[PDB]
Design a protein around this nucleic acid. Structure first.
Lengths: 52, 52, 89
RNA sequence: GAAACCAAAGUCUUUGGGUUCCGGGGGGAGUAUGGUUGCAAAGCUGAAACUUAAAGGAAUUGACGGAAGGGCACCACCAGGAGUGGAGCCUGCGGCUUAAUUUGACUCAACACGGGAAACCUCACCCGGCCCGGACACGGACAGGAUUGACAGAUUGAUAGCUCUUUCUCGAUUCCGUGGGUGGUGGUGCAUGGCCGUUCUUAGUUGGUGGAGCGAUUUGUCUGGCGAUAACGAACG
RNA sequence: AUGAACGAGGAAUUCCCAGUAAGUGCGGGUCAUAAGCUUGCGUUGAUUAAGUCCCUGCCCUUUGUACACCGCGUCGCU
């Protein structure tokens, strides 16, 4: 309802950086829905958080 | 192989496997409450996946 | 020669005929001559009569000035959806 | 008076009491140069080249608040009721095959909707076959025939002259091309009308008169918890 | 004849405030043949509430409001 999960195959980065994160072969991309008016009830768990 | 892990509700586990899954869920909840200092607040059968 | 537009860009579209008002560029293999230079164009009309057609000056000499021949292919769209078309011929 | 405002910022096109300084669209720029004062920092005086069609001043509303309140509704909620979602199945949707499994419609505002419970019809879709129902006008052919229809056999699903053989009928009612009209459940409902649905079954919409303002605009179309009350009346809903 | 699933159904969600839901049939449309659909009609018939903005939306009101600045670069020849 709020996000869509897509399975995809990740690429192999040719940059030999020592601090480069290892990309998994299979990845999941979650894209949150931004055009749906059903998210008006989610403010209860965000307004109570001191970090944001 | 681009197949997502099935949910805990849709998994047909045996009695020992169900007990092991319940113990793992309890341990994960204890680790989240104590070490991660966070409450999931949406923990259910559809929020848990069984893999290996 | 080959006739082209006299624009400022790199590619020059080939002109398949000589226009009566547009100023064109005639491009051909020729002995090299340093500009400026008066340029005259003649044709045998009949019985060795040199007829004048066009005139101008000599621009810079270079083989890098490419001439592009174009062909446009026509098609009649016989089915139309919104932003989608089915075209034949 | 541009107004904000001002008993002076009044006695100003009905323009003249005396006098001093100072501004001339915006930047460059209070910059450079020169002079002068200064221990110095600096000060006083102070350009141009070039650059732009605006820069600016007062007041009036509010698109929008990431500003806050109320108020409304079993297409929202509480108290519940009966349910669906779980079974089998009927019918609509997609996905999949199929020659076709026509198509329109995709949140409420599509999905037992298209009066759509389709054996033929319907029916548009697939396969096969038949007819012209080419109106009309021109040119050619045509009476010593332009043609139409047809028994029997071959073929054909078809007592389909549909084509051939077999040759029997028919009297311009035509035939072939040229233009050009019809016929389409063919394509655009993102080209239209009409009708319908929806926002919304909401609770609003517009005018007229009076008063304030040069004007945009304002009051009405109303502060309060009786009382203020430059406002009063209409019309649609 | 055959007798299956189906033991009141998670997450989630629909309609409903009185002759109302719900049960119950009947008639019309469709219809050569026909209703699980639809439109109507009677029959039997209640519990809860006389409220709220808690969810979903919608509606008004007042308060102001007509992309300001500080934090994209090195080298190369003609």
């Amino acid at each position: 309802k709020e996000s869509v999960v897509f399975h995809a195959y990740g690429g192999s980065m040719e940059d030999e950086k020592e601090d480069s994160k290892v990309i998994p072969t299979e990845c999941a991309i979650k894209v949150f829905k931004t055009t749906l008016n059903e998210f008006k009830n989610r403010d209860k768990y965000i307004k109570d958080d001191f970090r944001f | 192989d681009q197949v997502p892990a099935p949910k805990l509700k849709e998994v047909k586990l045996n009695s020992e496997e169900m007990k092991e899954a319940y113990y793992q869920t309890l341990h994960l909840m204890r680790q989240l409450y104590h070490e991660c200092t966070l409450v999931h607040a949406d923990l259910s059968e559809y929020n848990m996946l069984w893999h290996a | 020669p080959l006739f082209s537009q006299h624009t400022a860009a790199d590619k020059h579209k080939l002109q398949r005929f000589l226009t009566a008002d547009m100023a064109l560029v005639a491009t051909v293999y020729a002995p090299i001559t340093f500009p400026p230079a008066s340029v005259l164009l003649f044709k045998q009309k009949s019985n060795g009569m040199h007829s004048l057609i066009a005139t101008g000056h000599l621009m810079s000499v270079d083989p890098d000035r490419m001439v592009i021949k174009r062909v446009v292919l026509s098609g009649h769209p016989f089915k139309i959806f919104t932003k989608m078309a089915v075209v034949r011929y």
